[PDB]
Amino acid sequence: PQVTLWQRPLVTIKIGGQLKEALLDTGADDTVLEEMSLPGRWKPKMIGGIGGFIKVRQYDQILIEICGHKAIGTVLVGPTPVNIIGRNLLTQIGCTLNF
Amino acid sequence: PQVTLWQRPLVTIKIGGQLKEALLDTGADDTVLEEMSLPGRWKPKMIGGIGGFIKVRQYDQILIEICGHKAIGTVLVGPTPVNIIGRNLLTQIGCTLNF
Numbered sequence: 001p002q003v004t005l006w007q008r009p010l011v012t013i014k015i016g017g018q019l020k021e022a023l024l025d026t027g028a029d030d031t032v033l034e035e036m037s038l039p040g041r042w043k044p045k046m047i048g049g050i051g052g053f054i055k056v057r058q059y060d061q062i063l064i065e066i067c068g069h070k071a072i073g074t075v076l077v078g079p080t081p082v083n084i085i086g087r088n089l090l091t092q093i094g095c096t097l098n099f
Numbered sequence: 100p101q102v103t104l105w106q107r108p109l110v111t112i113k114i115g116g117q118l119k120e121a122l123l124d125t126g127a128d129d130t131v132l133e134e135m136s137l138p139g140r141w142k143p144k145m146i147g148g149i150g151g152f153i154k155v156r157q158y159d160q161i162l163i164e165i166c167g168h169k170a171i172g173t174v175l176v177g178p179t180p181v182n183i184i185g186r187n188l189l190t191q192i193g194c195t196l197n198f
């Protein structure tokens with residue numbers, strides 16, 4: 001699709017068999033979702049945002065469906081104000097900015 | 100232009116005949132520029148994101164040019180490490196996300 005920015009670019013994602021809403025965020029290097037139990041192994045990690053550094057859990061090789069397009073990659077789980085799809089997954093689904 | 104997301108979407112903006120680098124961010128409701136001394140009265144504001152909130156100064160009707168495209172609007176000045184172009188200015192130039 002072609003998504004305009006008059007509103008927040010929120011889409012439906014499917015992960016862990018759950019539907020959630022997530023923001024497409026090109027200012028984000030990685031994908032950060034709110035607290036959820038994902039299957040497998042995780043490793044603690046620190047990330048920064050405009051407010052500072054937070055701690056997250058890192059899950060590798062997670063399948064996520066974004067607007068029905070499949071992505072397999074890293075997901076950080078932590079205290080984010082919103083579910084955000086960063087560049088690691090935007091590139092997998094061949095998302096671009098245009099003007 | 101068609102900006103890919105393999106790298107951070109950094110472009111050149113011009114602000115009062117000053118060229119600067121800015122990240123094009125679809126996950127940003129507002130535009131945030133690095134600390135700078137703009138003539139004018141501002142209004143204090145607090146913006147949030149990963150990590151919490153920071154205090155910024157709000158200036159209205161600032162003219163910026165994103166890759167030779169004029170946008171005039173509300174800008175927040177705070178201690179960001181980078182200039183961030185948000186949705187408020189991204190819509191004025193025709194920016195869309197495509198996948």
Ligand SMILES: CC[C@H](C)[C@H](NC(=O)[C@H](C(C)C)[C@@H](O)[C@H](O)[C@H](CC1CCCCC1)NC(=O)[C@H](Cc1c[nH]c[nH+]1)NC(=O)COc1cccc2ccccc12)C(=O)NCc1ccccn1
Nearest residue numbers: 027028029030047048049050081126127128146147148149
């Ligand atoms: C900051 C702009 C804007 C004001 C704000 N938007 C956000 O904070 C977005 C969402 C959390 C909503 C946010 O992801 C945004 O895209 C920011 C932009 C970033 C600010 C730091 C400087 C570089 C650029 N990105 C992020 O916060 C992600 C989080 C992440 C994932 N992996 C690693 N980090 N950061 C990054 O990818 C890269 O970070 C950094 C890179 C280099 C230096 C840094 C120094 C300090 C801190 C961070 C640095 C907003 O709209 N907030 C209102 C709001 C919206 C929805 C919900 C609640 N509140």
